[PDB]
Design a protein around this nucleic acid. Structure first.
Length: 118
DNA sequence: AAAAAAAAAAGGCGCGTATATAAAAGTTTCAATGTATCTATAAACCTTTGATGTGTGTTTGTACAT
């Protein structure tokens, strides 16, 4: 549905004005909403400084609200995983405002213009 | 008293002191990367100990032979 477009649109921006690797964490956790954190790390098989700053954007854009996918461990102890429960509405909401802001960095800039007065 | 082996002793071989020329080969040293190994630490359990509704309990009022 538009939900695919929502994910589609997320890919575009995360690849339009973002680097290529930005969408890799998109698709990986887009495969399954409630995903174990290591699975993406395991399949990518990459370092934690090749994953940390990418995780930053996912929550810096709030696109991947990594839900604490708590599981029932067999040892009777703590169990959880960073399952990116995407907050589709809220993610774009800032984005639209984010977009607006750069336009303000042009809508204001229209007065910084052609013919010399100063 | 006589024979044999090592030291006393010096002068010099021959390139370290620069020393710059340049190519030719190679080393080591430095730093980013990767990994098992300490640790605390706060988050797992287990036990403890102070606060706690209440099952059982003292007065009220009872059908019920006695």
């Amino acid at each position: 549905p538009i939900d695919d477009i929502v994910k589609n649109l997320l890919k575009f921006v995360v690849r339009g004005f973002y680097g290529g690797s930005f969408v890799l964490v998109l698709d990986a956790i887009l495969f399954h909403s409630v995903l174990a954190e290591d699975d993406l790390k395991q399949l990518l098989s990459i370092n934690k400084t090749e994953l940390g700053p990418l995780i930053a954007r996912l929550r810096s854009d709030r696109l991947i609200s990594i839900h604490k996918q708590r599981e029932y461990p067999p040892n009777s102890k703590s169990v959880e995983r960073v399952y990116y429960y995407v907050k589709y509405p809220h993610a774009i909401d800032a984005i639209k405002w984010k977009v607006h802001q750069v336009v303000q960095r042009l809508k204001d800039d229209l007065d910084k213009n052609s013919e010399p007065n100063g």
